[PDB]
Ligand binder design. Structure first.
Ligand SMILES: [Mg+2]
Ligand SMILES: [Mg+2]
Lengths: 1115, 117
RNA sequence: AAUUUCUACUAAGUGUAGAUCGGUC
């Protein structure tokens, strides 16, 4: 038996077929002689007009709803919000009252003022024509009779807008949360210190010029929050604090410029008010327009560059401010500023750990991995490292504000170095006569500019805090947030330019046709039979869509068999066929009474000899005889007409009878020659019909049950599964490990090349050299945006080929899949495969492995299109990749690359040189330093109780040596250093005795420092397991200083060139093979646990029991 | 008809120049399409008359990326020289091959294309 | 560098090798 007998056809899955429809006969002539072109173009442009004018009409609806709304519980949320809360479950009553405000404004949204004539045909056919004056647009509205499919899609968008979801698109979140918490914040600023500011300009002059409404001091009460929620309250409230032209030549400023204008001590340490946002409802088409945007935003004397000068002046004000209360948002960039100011990253973590060692760590340290994970989530839990806390983390001769200031002037001085080469670009008469897509240097200037500005934007958004916190600085954060928002506007400029420059030279414009029927084939020949006006005709390997005109379809049903030739079988029984004649419908088409559009693709060609695609094998088994109900049709078939993009001037061909070269160096031929024309992108210069046929597979299921429980039951009685390590590598970019249930290596190989199989001919094609030349292109093009997109999409086709290889491994071996995991918190940044591409890889695993179909199998049995395998659940989110999804066993991975595959020793001795006290303690921690002359090696018998963070070992006492040689990478320089020549170099140097045993006390007799530093250096080389070259790919070997119980050391050069590798070949097979042994441990946990205990077996592996299993199960 | 015929003579000098460049583009196209995309030289590209016997190594527009895909112009059928891969769309019609990689290249490399193979 | 669209080819001569559900930012 096999494990695939129960996982077939468990649940449903919908698909959408796509095929090619071309006109046959005089159908184009009848569309030209029935005027079907101007009403679809005009109706489409009028549809964009409907989307604009319903954005405007819904904007007026928001103006109508939010105008006359008052509040009752306003003062209680303000007061109890600012009484410095007393949380005996108080903030759940405060926040629950805020939920009562959300149901109050949501009750105002849902309860009254229409809400029923808003998403139907009456809002667009009755209420909209009496609206929209200049009545030509009203004549543009009445041409949408019953076509409400894109209208109900836009209504799906506009019902996804207004809901009880409270996102940034929701207006209640914005007004209540943003405008109410900033309103209470402005009352906390306004009540504390405003008496220093003004008592004469506000109520006398500003009230007279601006509004002559209620007082500005009275705008901090209950009456104004009921008024500011309109658009005019935003215009007045931002017309007071921001300023407004007042319909004159005055151009008056606001209150914060008067805080700057007050001139108390020429520093103005006074709080500033927060601006409140507007409503949620407020060129990428030519070179000169986006270039003109660059002539608007990033020129020499904009407000944007002036805001950058306010950032430089703002860090000068930071030099004359304090260092307390300014919070830093905890992320990966606190390690970046740790690298900027201090020595290494986690050093600041270590100083945090120092305070943590002030609290929890006592004598006789009980540090475990649970303590390190609760300590790591405690580091996540704080999140509020201030600058005084980093000042306490600073040691002697470590000035935080001075080194910080010098390195941020180094950063913005590098940005000034980019600006220094950017001055002579657009001085006087910059009309660039070439194409923007053609020139290379200007794209390098704008690219390096937007990379410096955008990287500085990531740095300054890493200078946020947590928000809504305790006592915080009052003049830094104003221009910080405002210049941050301007910098987010030039982030949108980066979005526009980066979305413009990589435009392809062929455009894709598809649109669904209707042929003046708002009932176009919504079913499949149902009881209506004349409202759908279309049916599927068949003729051999050519299909023929029958679209009936309604002027003749009422009396078109004259279907004679005619007993001669041409049986065009129509589809019915909503699934069977009814025969017909040939010359009758030929008379209908040739007179202009019927339309027949050919369904066809590459795979229905007579000029073909190979295996067809997957959608074609979906379509052939659709109309087959023994279709029991597996693959069935569904509604919503959509015929998209597509226009032409490539004109007849820019076509480039491969001509006839000319021997052209060949790209692939693995081609056994070198030239090739044809007898006709091979064009460049012929499929876009034409006008083409493309049909979508949405099918559904297994709509009536057979067995609905829990998948992962059944996997854990069937593998509990099983003795030999297989595991498939798919790991991002340094040199071999992808690698495949396939291991058994015991641990013996079954099949390991690399994916540097892909073996193409066609007609029995097996031709390989390498992607290591090809994408290596693409990294040569990224290394030299003076441009990278098109290059990086070629790497991303090249890796997308690459991972599609990898999806084919993994599907062949599941259809061939039927393994359980431990591969590499994205949510382990690991980050190395050394491999050539980035994270987002591998997210697209596992995303294509989710979208692929829902219903997996073999292409070269029997359709009667399982594996084909009828009975394909359902081995992975649906797609929910990116966070759904949590430790288990079907047979995709997500396994996190800590310490798998840099660990011995033979013994299992991992880097635990922290051999960074600290001082001479811990060097004498380091050498004094060795219990036996002895030398023998026969081995000519240096023995190290030591105890792991005397070292920090070595409690995770099971024996604690080990025998180590030094075997082979090492490559000391930098004195790069390639400083290849041996073992006995270095210790005898130092011992014959400095002249100490080494021909005797037990010299662990003779080594501590020295008082010089370079002896201990050189000995820590030789410990660093002895424990450096990555014995690579980083130059040529001669020997990327992995030799270990620790032998097993057999007595032999692991030299990977011996175990590489073998026919049956019992040991891994490099570090990638080491890592993926160790993830494979982690699932071998997890199936060990399946052997330990009970039957129902399989519901809650921990699969997320630790490292202490991974060192236990890694050491105690080597044989 | 004095200076008009003079600039016509200048246009005929540029005609002989652009036909020398087109002739060397044709023969150079034959010796380049003889190569299996690995022994190709690193070629300076231009959409301007580039005159390999009068090459000026002055401007920073000099580039040394490996050429390929030298196909037609099927309204006028040309050898066209993409300077990168297939998907970079950097078609040109004036080329001069030089010695090796970027940065102050060597000078001409005239008629040594048979020594590349 | 020819496709139902995307990617690497020419791959036995108007193709070949894989993958793809969905109208919405
Ligand atoms: Mg095919
Ligand atoms: Mg292509």
């Amino acid at each position: 038996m096999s494990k695939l007998e129960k996982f077939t056809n468990c649940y449903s899955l919908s698909k959408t077929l796509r095929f090619k429809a071309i006109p046959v006969g005089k159908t184009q002539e009848n569309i030209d002689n029935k005027r079907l072109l101007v009403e679809d173009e005009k109706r489409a442009e009028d549809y964009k007009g409907v989307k604009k004018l319903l954005d405007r009409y819904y904007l007026s609806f928001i103006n109508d709803v939010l105008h006359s709304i008052k509040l009752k519980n306003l003062n209680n949320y303000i007061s109890l919000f600012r009484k410095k809360t007393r949380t005996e479950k108080e903030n759940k009553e405060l926040e629950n009252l805020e939920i009562n405000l959300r149901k109050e404004i949501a009750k105002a949204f849902k309860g009254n003022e229409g809400y029923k004539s808003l998403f139907k045909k009456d809002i667009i056919e009755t209420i909209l024509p009496e609206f929209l004056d200049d009545k030509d647009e009203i004549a543009l509205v009445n041409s949408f009779n019953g076509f409400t499919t894109a209208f109900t899609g836009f209504f799906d968008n506009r019902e996804n807008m207004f809901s009880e979801e409270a996102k940034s698109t929701s207006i209640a979140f914005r007004c209540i949360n943003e405008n109410l918490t900033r309103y209470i914040s402005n009352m906390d600023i306004f009540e504390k210190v405003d008496a220093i500011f003004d008592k004469h300009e506000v109520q006398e002059i500003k009230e007279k010029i601006l509004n002559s409404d209620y007082d500005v001091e009275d705008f901090f009460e209950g009456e104004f929050f009921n008024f500011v929620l309109t658009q005019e309250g935003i215009d007045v409230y931002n017309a007071i604090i921001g300023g407004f032209v007042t319909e004159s030549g005055e151009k008056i400023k606001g209150l914060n410029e008067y805080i700057n204008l007050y001139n108390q001590k020429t520093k103005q340490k006074l709080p500033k008010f927060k601006p409140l946002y507007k409503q949620v409802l407020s060129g990428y088409t030519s070179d000169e327009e986006v270039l003109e945007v660059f002539r608007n935003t990033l020129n020499k004397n904009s407000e944007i560059f002036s805001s950058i000068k306010k950032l430089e002046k703002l860090f000068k004000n930071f030099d004359e401010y304090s260092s307390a209360g300014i919070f830093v948002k905890n992320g990966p960039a606190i390690s970046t500023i740790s690298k900027d100011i201090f020595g290494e990253w986690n050093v600041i973590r270590d100083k945090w750990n120092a305070e943590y060692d002030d609290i929890h760590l006592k004598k006789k340290a009980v540090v475990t991995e649970k303590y390190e994970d609760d300590r790591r989530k405690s580091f996540k839990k704080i999140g509020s490292f201030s600058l005084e806390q980093l000042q306490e983390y600073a040691d002697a001769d470590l000035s935080v504000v001075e080194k910080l200031k010098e390195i941020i002037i180094q950063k913005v001085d590098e940005i000034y170095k980019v600006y220094g080469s950017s001055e002579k670009l657009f001085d006087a008469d910059f009309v660039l006569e070439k194409s923007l897509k053609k020139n290379d240097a200007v794209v390098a200037i704008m690219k390096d500019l937007l990379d410096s500005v955008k990287s500085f934007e990531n740095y300054i958004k890493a200078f946020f805090g947590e928000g809504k916190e305790t006592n915080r600085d009052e003049s830094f954060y104003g221009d910080f947030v405002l210049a941050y928002d301007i910098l987010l506007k030039v982030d949108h400029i980066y979005d526009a330019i980066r979305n413009y420059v990589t435009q392809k030279p062929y455009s894709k414009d598809k649109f669904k046709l209707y042929f003046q029927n708002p009932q176009f084939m919504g079913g499949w020949d149902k009881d209506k039979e004349t409202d759908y006006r279309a049916t599927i005709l068949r003729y051999g390997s050519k299909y023929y869509l029958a679209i009936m005109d309604k002027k003749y379809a009422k009396c078109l049903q004259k279907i004679d068999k005619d007993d001669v030739n041409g049986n065009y079988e129509k589809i019915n029984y909503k699934v069977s066929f009814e025969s017909a004649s040939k010359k009758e419908v030929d008379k209908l088409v040739e007179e202009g009474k019927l339309y027949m559009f050919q369904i066809y693709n590459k795979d229905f060609s007579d000029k073909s000899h190979g295996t067809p695609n997957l959608h074609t094998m979906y379509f052939k088994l659709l109309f087959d005889e023994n279709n029991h109900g597996q693959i069935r049709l569904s509604g919503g078939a959509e015929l998209f007409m597509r226009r032409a993009s490539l004109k007849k001037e820019e076509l480039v061909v491969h001509p006839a009878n000319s021997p052209i070269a060949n790209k692939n160096p693995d081609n056994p031929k070198k030239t090739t020659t044809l007898s006709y024309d091979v064009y460049k992108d012929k499929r876009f210069s034409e006008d083409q019909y493309e049909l979508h046929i949405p099918i559904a597979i297994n709509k009536c299921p057979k067995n609905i049950f829990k998948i992962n429980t059944e996997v854990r039951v069937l593998l509990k009685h099983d003795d030999n599964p297989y595991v498939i390590g798919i790991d991002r590598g340094e040199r071999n970019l992808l690698y495949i490990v396939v291991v058994d249930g015991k641990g013996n290596i079954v099949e390991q190989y690399s994916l540097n090349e892909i073996i193409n199989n066609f007609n029995g001919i097996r031709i390989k094609t390498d992607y290591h050299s090809l994408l290596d030349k693409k990294e040569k292109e990224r290394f030299e093009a003076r441009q990278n945006w098109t290059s990086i997109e070629n790497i991303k999409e090249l890796k997308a086709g690459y991972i599609s080929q990898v999806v084919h290889k993994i599907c062949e491994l599941v259809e061939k071996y039927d393994a359980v899949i431990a591969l590499e995991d994205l949510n382990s918190g690991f980050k190395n940044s050394r491999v050539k495969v980035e994270k987002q591409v591998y997210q697209k890889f596992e995303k294509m695993l989710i979208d692929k492995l829902n219903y997996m179909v073999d292409k070269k199998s029997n359709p009667c049995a399982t594996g084909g299109a009828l009975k394909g395998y359902q081995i992975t659940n649906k797609f929910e989110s990116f966070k759904s990749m949590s430790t288990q999804n079907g047979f995709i066993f997500y396994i996190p991975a800590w310490l798998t690359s840099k660990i011995d595959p033979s013994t299992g020793f991992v880097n635990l001795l922290k051999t960074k040189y600290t001082s001479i006290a811990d060097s004498k303690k380091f050498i004094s921690s060795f219990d036996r330093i002895m030398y023998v002359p026969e081995e000519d090696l240096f023995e190290f018998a030591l105890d792991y109780k005397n070292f920090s963070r070595t409690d995770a070992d099971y024996i604690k006492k080990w025998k180590l040596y030094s075997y082979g040689n090492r490559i000391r990478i930098f004195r790069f320089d390639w400083e290849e250093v041996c073992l006995t020549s270095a210790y005898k170099e130092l011992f014959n140097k400095y002249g100490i005795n080494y021909q005797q045993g037990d010299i662990r006390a003779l080594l501590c007799e020295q008082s010089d420092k370079a002896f201990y530093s050189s000995f820590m250096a030789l410990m660093s080389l002895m424990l450096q397991m990555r014995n690579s070259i980083t130059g040529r790919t001669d020997v990327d070997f992995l030799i270990s200083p620790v032998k097993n119980s057999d007595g032999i050391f692991y030299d990977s050069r011996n175990y590489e060139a073998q026919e049956n590798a019992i040991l891994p070949k490099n570090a990638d097979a080491n890592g993926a093979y160790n993830i494979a042994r982690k699932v071998l441990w997890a199936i060990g946990q399946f052997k330990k646990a009970e039957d129902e205990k399989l519901d809650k077996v921990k699969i997320a592996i630790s490292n202490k029991e991974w060192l236990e299993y890694a050491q105690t199960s080597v044989k | 008809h004095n200076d008009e015929m003079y600039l016509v003579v200048q246009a005929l000098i540029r005609a002989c120049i652009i036909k020398e460049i087109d002739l060397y583009t044709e023969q150079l196209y034959n010796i380049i399409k003889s190569l299996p995309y690995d022994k190709r030289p690193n070629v300076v590209y231009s959409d301007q008359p580039l005159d390999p016997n009068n090459l000026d190594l002055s401007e920073p527009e000099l580039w040394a990326e490996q050429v390929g895909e030298c196909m037609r112009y099927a309204h006028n059928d040309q050898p066209c020289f993409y300077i990168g891969s297939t998907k970079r769309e950097l078609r040109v019609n004036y080329i001069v091959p030089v010695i090796g990689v970027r940065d102050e290249i060597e000078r001409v490399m005239t008629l040594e294309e048979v020594r590349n193979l």
